[PDB]
Amino acid sequence: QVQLQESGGGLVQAGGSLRLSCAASGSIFSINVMGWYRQAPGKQRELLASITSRGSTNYADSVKDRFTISRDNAKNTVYLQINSLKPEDTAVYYCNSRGWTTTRGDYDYWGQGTQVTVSSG
């Protein structure tokens, strides 16, 4: 089993930027994809960015040049840098850990998410 905890969000002026953090507990499986999603109230959840065990990244086209996913150099932690924030970027941002193993099959674990609120006058 695997457990994720996001942090780094909160309130921010439009034009700012945040580094969100997803701390991963438990086993780090040999086949794993860590993903960042967001969900605005009412709207459907939106996959923003993924990173594999070997550092290969996969972005949603709409944010490929504004958001950046990465992994800490040593810690069991992945980051999402979200730059040039606009009010439209207000949402809960969720981390997930997903894959498959020869022993237990598909797996899929979700964080509880960190709320980001982008303000303007």
Partner: peptide, 28 residues
Amino acid sequence: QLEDKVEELLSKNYHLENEVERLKKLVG
């Protein structure tokens, strides 16, 4: 590796699931 290959195919799979989901709810 073969584990890297599955990881890449799964990453691709999840991206396509979400893109279809967004496109299904949008048009439907």
